[PDB]
Amino acid sequence: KLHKEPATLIKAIDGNTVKLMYKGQPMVFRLLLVDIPYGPEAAAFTKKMVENAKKIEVQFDKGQRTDKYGRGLAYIYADGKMVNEALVRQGLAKVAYVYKGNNTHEQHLRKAEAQAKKEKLNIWS
């Protein structure tokens, strides 16, 4: 049972990294299960999604919540749409290996990735 928490964008950093205001504090977040080999495109895509959002949500998974560099490991939602999956579906990123038990949406993203590859979209072109 994963819970979505409200957050506020502070600065877009790149395809799978953004800075947010979470629980009265700024924190860098690394989008779970998404690897970025189109770097500028992914960055642009994510940047557009969060900056144009009227609601940003942070959803931690069931495993470790922060990586070695202190970045929050989570699923980020823009207006209810998961950025992690959108990137993958748009073929602007691949599904990463599960990390410390954070695999709740792994299957979901794998299908997005399969369809993207089936459409030979961007990184799959």
- Resolution (angstroms) stands at 2.2
Tell me the one-letter amino acid at 73: L
The architecture in CATH of the region 1-125 reads Beta Barrel (2.40)
Rounded to whole angstroms, the Cα distance separating 72 from 51 reads 19
Q: From which experimental method does this structure derive? A: X-ray
